[PDB]
Design a protein around this nucleic acid. Structure first.
Lengths: 129, 129, 129, 129, 129, 129
RNA sequence: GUCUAAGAC
RNA sequence: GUCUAAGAC
């Protein structure tokens, strides 16, 4: 059994599909990277630690690169023009049962479901109004 | 036009559906709260600010309460035994077009899609392995 | 659903009713204005926030114009002589359930009901006696 | 006659009706309370004062209690779990006619009428949107 | 209804039309932007505040960008060569009727109508003479 | 050719149009006034200068009289209660070609076009909502 | 503006 | 009043 495997990060039907694969798991930090130049790859990292007596804290991080070619002195390199950085911290008390957790996951999914306020605002360079 | 409206945070088919509604929008912070006792409600807040010359930063926060009744001195009150706290920060360079943004949203959705590593780990009081 | 719709403030059985419609929503402070010059209009504003860690607080303000010997569309000074100001503040503990709130609303309705000492005193330029 | 009479504050259709009665006028503040122990009674107070040289100001307060029985020192006492507080201040110019004042009363009644936005929001534990 | 809707800012007869849409209302400032990267978008903002005791003041701003692609560090980024800035402040007395306000709108429209002196001068890079 | 000619500021389809004609040109500041007492007239002024080394700046000012309950030719005080003031400032970089300027004009026309959120809000003594 | 509410900060 | 523009001098 293992959940440290590759998965589809960006789903574009069956074409542009961005897949991210296990890269490293040093120091309690699982890391996934998409293929090709590390310089233009997507990155996802995750780690759980016992943040206190009653809480466990998850720290998920995602990097979305803007793929581009950099030319300097006539030498070109695959780079990322810039990167968008996602960073989330989820705290869960140790009293939470598996059902409680499933619910927390559903809340996260609903928050980002297509059509709801937050994803729509983000997807359009907008805020709330 | 408005995206500051109510939406379904937790989708339980058509039954246990947790809906969250606009509560307040003071100081650039949009806030949504589910119904009934504020003390046991779900809360979602969001805000975007220009974090620097080239970046806009979104700050989404979600609270999932563990509903319970507190009895003290024979007086009972609707409370939350505890709360799970989600907190995310998303940074997006001003060069990102609407397409770039749609992609960032899809990455967030894929990250939490059912069956993928992170949501499965969370939903089971587990980490990565 | 969406409660920021126009409603009837002063009801005179259809003929000569005073309808007030949404006119502003800056900072989450909902505002309703009648179809008049801002100086002679009926204004209603409402907003909610968590005043303390234990209570939420609704703040409602109403402005009613003096109609006797009024000159529609004219410049009437001093403004203090032609306008009445109503300022309501409802503090509700966070333990109040939807039902508890329905009761609180019913109480406010009874307070101002036709025939009761309070409204009948105001309508007669009187106090209690 | 005398307008300092008892009236029904919460109408639950003849049964469960919270009625309130005159209970004090000391210091120019008319008070009404329900038939309970002072510790868990509904309370309504009213006072008018000539605030400015050209204004009169009514100050009205209502207290809605959440009745509970509490065990203090092994002994049960009738008490209030919490109280909701309505506080209104109405400023009317002296130039206002009785007809002008009736308008103010009708506006306050329409404001709280069943189905209109504000009472709807309050009863649903939400804001206006 | 809601007047916070998208509208076409630059009409190039159905094709090449710059349309602008709601994108933010944080802090009482309504914002609209075109569908570009924040770095090269058209932007329109509006806010009303009760400046004096007898005035209301609208503050409107429009930003027209000269889109260009710039090579920074050997990488191409969508940027604006320069921006043109329109800034208008309108002060209306509270005694103004809706009919009085329509007059203000009609005057602003006539001011900028095709062929009239001012737009003619601006479009020709000249002064009035 | 010579743009300092009289034009129509407020158009009501011929019947009751408000034409404004040149009335002053001191210091290159072109001025247009309607056929009224300077206190009740419609005034328009315009001037251009190089605000900085990079931009030129048009400064337009419009004054619109309050007509409701107005007394043609009378002395109406306070002046602040009977006049609305519009103050436009257009900053245009020195790189803007005639075309670039034609676009900027088109944008201003769209902003104030009939039916769009901005003019329709002003004409209704409203803000955005 | 707040609250523990005709009196408190 | 200026600008590099809801925030700067």
């Amino acid at each position: 059994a293992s959940n440290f495997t590759q998965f589809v990060l960006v789903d574009n039907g069956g074409t542009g599909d961005v897949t991210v694969a296990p890269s490293n798991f040093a120091n309690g930090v699982a890391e996934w990277i998409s293929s090709n130049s590390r310089s233009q790859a997507y990155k996802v990292t995750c780690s759980v630690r016992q943040s206190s007596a009653q809480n466990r804290k998850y720290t998920i991080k995602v990097e979305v690169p803007k793929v581009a070619t950099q030319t300097v002195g006539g030498v070109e390199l695959p780079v990322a023009a810039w990167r968008s950085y996602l960073s989330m911290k989820l705290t869960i008390p140790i009293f939470a049962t598996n059902s409680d957790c499933e619910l927390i996951v559903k809340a996260m999914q609903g928050l980002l479901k297509d059509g709801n306020p937050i994803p729509s605002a983000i997807a359009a360079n907008s805020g709330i109004y």
